[PDB]
């Protein structure tokens, strides 16, 4: 059983540099003019990917940057030059012998004093919004730092490219109608588009231009109250009746307002029972709630009945809808 | 007449080493940087990097450094990123543009965009899921899963690697497509390997299970010669302790437009986490707040809109008070 000792068992280096990472065997670990040394690259969380083969052979998709060489009980790793992406621990392995081995490990890490820099957040709040055509409207946008009036407003229709409306905060580019508007400085921007026409619907971005990296904001949709649940009933599974339960779920995709009512029909007969409620918060896409319902009971009482229905009550239902099955 | 060319949409493979151009025309390709934005449909926009025509300079995003790559051919006037080894992270719409400049940088932005390139990943196809019990006692035994996809282990041998907190990778054994089984020398007597073709599966046993048994385990393929380990699982987490009182949870049971989804019911302590195709899945999910039962446990629901066989539907489930994860799909 051959041992690999590698060396050292972490470094720190800088960005740009060379690294390289030994790995010594026991015996040797060449047969037939090739040794039978490999190299695989652990990223944090990760499972471990395949770098290099037969000590010198990189596999596809792997940098020309990492190389190794070695022969005998002598082999190295090398990462010239070192990128963000490589801090990971390295292994070395074998299967020069029937029983395969790896090496301790050298936990490579980027350095680390002195850091950087961060990097700037954009944020464009409401992420959705709806109006009508010939009104003036506006339009808000944050910073994290400052970039004074280094700020774009981007415009994109759904499977189109970005068209730049508004530069360094308050310009309009050219052929930008005289409706659209800017204004704002240092961490707060806002668009404005009076007497809004058709054309004006797209997802509305906004871009920095003070520091590298270039960031852009999240985005803002424009559309132009009542929602019914879209009712659905779930029954239990195979998997959940032998464990000798029944879970019944009664599913109120996307609704709005919040009140609605649901009543549980255990086979044409209106009974409140064992039955609990989850709901999801106020959307920020269209604000509309999600609910289920899931009367749990026994297999002792369920497997009699093969139908069941679910009542539900909802404003935007003229009267209440009732969901079954048939197992 | 200012205008920025691209190449065509990109079936991409994981690993990968694709080259998407962007041929400038219509003015001085020399004078302004080419930069390169990259969309996905749930994000927005971000920065890779830039490049100078004039002479070849370049500065992308700590990001996409050693990722993505960025050359120019001035007797072509064309831009290429040369993205190697991707992933269904790079699932994504790229932009060439360039940062136009008045009065020195009095005004700057990116005025002509190029149309797009929408770049694609595939979802592996070769498969390897571990399996096992989060949870087990000192002198007790453990018993992990191999659960192989888009390969059969008739011809494909299989490896059951450990990987201790703190220690390196430990090799356990091998199983070879002819059966032939292979050990560790220093750990044979304690190791059970076998396999089920059938099922499409791998099994370890170990034995007098000390508190340094405590490991990721995890099954690796063999490629063809030099047979070093070219596919491995995500691993599955095995700790040793005295005690886990108590002790268990998480049971996973299945559930116009089609909506589909999971149950997560009796488990305890709280909470249980939920994602879905491990993560490449947040449009139209519904994943219900918990509620404590009747049985004292706790039980919650994950729901997923989705339209009317084809796409692979994962439900990602944690619940950590039990050392357990598991995945589920979804079927009628």
């Known amino acids: 059983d051959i041992v690999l000792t590698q060396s050292p068992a972490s470094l720190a280096v800088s960005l740009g540099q060379r690294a390289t990472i030994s790995c010594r065997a026991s015996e040797s670990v060449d047969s037939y003019g090739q040794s039978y040394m490999h190299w695989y690259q652990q990223k944090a969380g990760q499972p471990p990917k395949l770098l290099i083969y037969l000590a010198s052979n990189l596999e596809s998709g792997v940098p020309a940057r990492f190389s190794g060489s070695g022969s005998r009980t002598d082999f190295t790793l090398t990462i010239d030059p070192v990128q963000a992406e490589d801090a990971a621990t390295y292994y070395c392995?074998?299967?020069?012998?029937?029983?395969?081995?790896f090496g301790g490990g050298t936990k490579l890490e980027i350095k680390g004093q002195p850091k950087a820099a961060p990097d700037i957040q954009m944020t464009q709040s409401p992420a959705s919004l709806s109006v009508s055509v010939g009104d003036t409207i506006t339009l808000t946008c944050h910073a994290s730092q400052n970039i004074d009036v280094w700020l774009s407003w981007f415009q994109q229709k759904p499977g189109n490219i970005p068209k730049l409306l508004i530069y360094k905060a308050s310009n309009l580019h050219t052929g930008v109608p005289s409706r659209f508007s800017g204004s704002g400085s240092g961490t707060g921007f806002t668009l404005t588009i009076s007497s809004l026409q058709p054309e004006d619907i797209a997802t509305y971005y906004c871009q920095q231009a003070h520091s590298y990296p270039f960031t852009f904001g999240g985005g803002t949709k424009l559309e132009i109250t009542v929602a019914a649940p879209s009712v659905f009933i779930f029954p239990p599974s195979d998997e959940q009746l032998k464990s000798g339960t029944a879970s019944v779920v009664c599913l109120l995709n996307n609704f709005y307002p919040r009140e609605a009512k649901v009543q549980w029909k255990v086979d044409n007969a209106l009974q409140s029972g064992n039955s609990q409620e989850s709901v999801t918060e106020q959307d920020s896409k269209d604000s509309t709630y999600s609910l289920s319902s899931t009367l749990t009971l026994s297999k002792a009482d369920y497997e009699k009945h093969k139908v069941y229905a679910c009542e539900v009550t909802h404003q935007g239902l003229s009267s209440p809808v009732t969901m079954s099955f048939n197992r | 007449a200012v205008q920025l060319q691209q190449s065509g949409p990109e079936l991409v493979k994981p690993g990968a080493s694709v080259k998407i151009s962007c041929k400038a025309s219509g003015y001085s390709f020399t004078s302004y940087w080419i930069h390169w934005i990259k969309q996905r449909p749930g994000q927005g926009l971000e920065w890779i990097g830039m490049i100078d025509p004039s002479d070849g300079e370049t500065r992308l995003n700590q990001r996409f450094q050693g990722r993505a790559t960025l050359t120019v051919d001035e007797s072509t006037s064309t831009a290429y990123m040369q993205l190697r080894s991707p992933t269904s992270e790079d699932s994504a719409v790229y932009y060439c543009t360039r940062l136009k400049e008045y009065g020195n940088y009095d005004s700057f932005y990116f005025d002509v965009w190029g149309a797009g390139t929408l770049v694609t990943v595939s979802s592996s196809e070769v498969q390897l899921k571990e399996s096992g019990p989060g949870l087990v006692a000192p002198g007790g035994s453990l018993s992990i899963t191999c659960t192989v996809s888009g390969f059969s282990l008739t011809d494909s041998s299989i490896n059951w690697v450990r990987q201790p907190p703190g220690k390196g990778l430990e090799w356990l054994g091998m199983?070879?497509?002819?059966?032939?089984?292979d050990y560790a020398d220093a750990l044979k007597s304690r190791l059970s390997i076998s396999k089920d073709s059938s099922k499409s599966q791998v099994f370890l046993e170990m034995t007098s299970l000390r508190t340094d048994d405590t490991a990721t385990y995890y099954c690796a393929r063999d490629g063809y010669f030099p047979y070093a380990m070219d596919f491995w699982g995500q691993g599955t987490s095995v700790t040793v302790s005295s005690r886990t009182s108590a002790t268990k949870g998480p049971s996973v049971f299945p559930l116009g437009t089609a909506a589909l989804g999971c149950l997560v019911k009796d488990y305890f302590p709280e909470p249980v986490t939920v994602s879905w195709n491990s993560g490449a899945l947040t449009s139209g999910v519904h994943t219900f707040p918990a509620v404590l039962q009747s049985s004292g446990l706790y039980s919650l629901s994950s729901v997923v809109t989705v339209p009317s066989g084809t796409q692979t539907y994962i439900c990602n489930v944690n619940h950590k008070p039990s050392n357990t994860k598991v995945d589920k799909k979804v079927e009628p």
């Open positions: 392995q074998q299967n020069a012998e029937d029983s395969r081995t």
């Open positions: 199983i070879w497509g002819d059966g032939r089984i």
